[PDB]
Amino acid sequence: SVPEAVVNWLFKVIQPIYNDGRTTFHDSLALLDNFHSLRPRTRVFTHSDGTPQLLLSIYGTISTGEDGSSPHSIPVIMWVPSMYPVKPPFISINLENFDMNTISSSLPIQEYIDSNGWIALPILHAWDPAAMNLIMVVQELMSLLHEPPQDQA
Ligand SMILES: [Cl-]
Ligand SMILES: [Zn+2]
Ligand SMILES: [Zn+2]
Ligand SMILES: [Zn+2]
Ligand SMILES: [Zn+2]
Ligand SMILES: [Zn+2]
Ligand SMILES: [Zn+2]
Ligand SMILES: [Zn+2]
Ligand SMILES: [Zn+2]
Ligand SMILES: [Zn+2]
């Protein structure tokens, strides 16, 4: 389980920041419970126009579906916007820790990444606030570390 001290800190830090604190709290905790390789922190986000904003961020690694001598995970940083779930999370690669020399360019990461390190996902282009959550975003991210199955005829 998520440690008690972290649960209570999460509730406290969310209240003053989030338009929908109940949803942000629940969904953040569900993400942490389902992905033990992720953990929370608060950080000042710098918006494009310069505006700073204190936000909850969830960071760690997600699975490549490989192990042994193969790369096992990719480091990521998610930011939960203050209007969540009306606005979806921002997702980035942790660039400083990205294993450029081992992770295969065969992973379609380059398809989805911008020059600033942000990841676009199809779920973000079909975002449905009432019916989606943070877990779904991470599950999709995991699926997009792989090229689709092809027509084999
Ligand atoms: Cl790889
Ligand atoms: Zn408690
Ligand atoms: Zn809500
Ligand atoms: Zn729940
Ligand atoms: Zn749980
Ligand atoms: Zn294996
Ligand atoms: Zn690989
Ligand atoms: Zn591709
Ligand atoms: Zn694959
Ligand atoms: Zn065909």
Side-chain angles (χ1 to χ4, degrees):
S1 76
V2 176
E4 184 69 33
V6 178
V7 175
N8 297 315
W9 165 89
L10 191 67
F11 176 91
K12 293 195 308 192
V13 301
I14 284 167
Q15 303 313 293
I17 296 171
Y18 290 87
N19 192 39
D20 187 346
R22 178 56 63 190
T23 295
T24 299
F25 172 75
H26 173 275
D27 287 18
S28 295
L29 193 66
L31 182 67
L32 296 174
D33 258 16
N34 287 109
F35 297 106
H36 298 152
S37 59
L38 292 178
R39 44 192 175 275
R41 64 185 177 194
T42 42
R43 287 290 186 273
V44 181
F45 186 86
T46 298
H47 289 269
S48 181
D49 73 8
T51 296
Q53 183 182 26
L54 181 68
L55 291 178
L56 175 73
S57 178
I58 291 166
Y59 73 104
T61 61
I62 59 160
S63 179
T64 58
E66 303 186 72
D67 61 12
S69 292
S70 302
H72 176 64
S73 67
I74 292 172
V76 300
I77 299 175
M78 166 187 288
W79 296 82
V80 188
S82 59
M83 286 294 298
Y84 181 80
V86 177
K87 298 193 178 184
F90 299 103
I91 306 296
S92 67
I93 302 287
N94 188 331
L95 299 174
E96 180 180 0
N97 289 303
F98 185 85
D99 198 356
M100 291 294 323
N101 293 302
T102 312
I103 295 167
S104 178
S105 54
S106 294
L107 283 64
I109 298 174
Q110 183 177 352
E111 296 190 29
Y112 289 107
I113 201 172
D114 69 21
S115 297
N116 294 350
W118 300 110
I119 300 167
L121 292 183
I123 192 174
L124 306 179
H125 301 134
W127 185 249
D128 193 5
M132 296 186 171
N133 62 35
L134 302 174
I135 289 165
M136 294 177 70
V137 175
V138 173
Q139 293 172 325
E140 181 156 302
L141 183 56
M142 289 166 66
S143 81
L144 275 35
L145 297 182
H146 311 267
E147 295 282 10
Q150 307 290 311
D151 191 331
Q152 291 183 327

